Design a protein around this ligand. Sequence first.
Ligand SMILES: N[C@@H](CCC(=O)N[C@@H](CS)C(=O)NCC(=O)O)C(=O)O
Ligand SMILES: N[C@@H](CCC(=O)N[C@@H](CS)C(=O)NCC(=O)O)C(=O)O
Ligand SMILES: [Cl-]
Ligand SMILES: [Cl-]
Ligand SMILES: [K+]
Ligand SMILES: [K+]
Lengths: 219, 218
Amino acid sequence: AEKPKLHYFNARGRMESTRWLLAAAGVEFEEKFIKSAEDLDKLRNDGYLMFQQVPMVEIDGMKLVQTRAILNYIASKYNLYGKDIKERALIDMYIEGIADLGEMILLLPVCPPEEKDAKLALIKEKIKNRYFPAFEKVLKSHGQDYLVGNKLSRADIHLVELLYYVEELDSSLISSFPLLKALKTRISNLPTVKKFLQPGSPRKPPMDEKSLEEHRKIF
Amino acid sequence: AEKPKLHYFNARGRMESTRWLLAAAGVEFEEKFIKSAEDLDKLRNDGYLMFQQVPMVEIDGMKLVQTRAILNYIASKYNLYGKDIKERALIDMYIEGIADLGEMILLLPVCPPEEKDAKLALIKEKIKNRYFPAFEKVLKSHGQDYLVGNKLSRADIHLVELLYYVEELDSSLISSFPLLKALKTRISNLPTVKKFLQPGSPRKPPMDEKSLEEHRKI
Ligand SMILES: N[C@@H](CCC(=O)N[C@@H](CS)C(=O)NCC(=O)O)C(=O)O
Ligand SMILES: N[C@@H](CCC(=O)N[C@@H](CS)C(=O)NCC(=O)O)C(=O)O
Ligand SMILES: [Cl-]
Ligand SMILES: [Cl-]
Ligand SMILES: [K+]
Ligand SMILES: [K+]
């Protein structure tokens, strides 16, 4: 069984949700870090990046780019995409909500600093009034441990990844959402996930002022 | 038999790719157009919109929001999402590229006016050097009429949609890409797509800064 190989910077960025999903599924993978503009040029010139961009994942004979394509493939392969078309529709709707909020956060430290504090408050309010209530409502309507089909899926994993990111941003945001808190604890305790949250795993740290400025300089 | 209901404004925006897919698949649908802040409030208050946003499509007993979720469901249901996991991976890769370029073009008339010149030039540079070559290469390497599995899929339909948007932007960008021209012709002459492209269909015009700087008030 040939191990998936992830090509990305040694950073969270657009590769983290893939690290989470693979690791939640107990799937062992290798990372090949891109450290120089030469490292990227080499992947490009080898014809390995369909749109000249990373992330790229080598898996089951394919050089897969585009985050959503990579994630969809992994989730079907490891039975984390529900069990039929309608379950997939619910999963997709949830993760796309997650992706909207998460995209706003991914792209917050690269925004204009005079309207960056306007952007931070906008997020915070969407979280409290838009997204966290939407997921709390799903959990409450099923009363089950999982968002869809009463079974672990990518939606649970990605929601919990998101709750970790929202906690780094402000710890009080989840405080009035008891069902989200319990989901985070439950998923964090699954064996694969617990292992991923432990030190020494492929899970990556947040980008700080140092690692961001250096990245832009060399690429 | 029992039609999908699309909830959006009377415009392309984020609902147009859904109109194209449903039309291509042979599926007749209804549109319930949002006209005021008050129609949108009703949708919200009635618990129709999971994240308070449109597009929303009522289909097969569900109330689906999020463009990609809608498209993904329609594509599987009507067998436009390939035959297996590996083909769906190709389709997904291709459609996500299309989406990236398509979003750049969607947001073009909305960027700060002073960035418009630079952004348009970068879009045209991406089209000529990144996107169109990628897709030309796929069609050339297989020698087939369709992008994936020698069979019609959403990737053909959504690429051809994008070739129409790019044509509106600049009709010369496709000129050095003969297999893209030929795919456009072929898909355009499929009866369902031909019908949808005819005058009178649910196909929507380009945004105008009339209906644009006025649909923000919704
Ligand atoms: N839609 C793509 C975006 C990929 C992307 O924006 N990659 C960036 C790095 S995070 C890149 O390789 N930039 C190089 C370039 O566009 O020339 C995805 O989700 O994978
Ligand atoms: N990622 C979502 C975006 C949906 C979206 O941005 N909808 C806009 C109009 S096109 C909206 O309902 N905005 C109202 C709001 O954000 O309060 C999708 O693809 O459906
Ligand atoms: Cl996911
Ligand atoms: Cl599509
Ligand atoms: K689930
Ligand atoms: K195809």
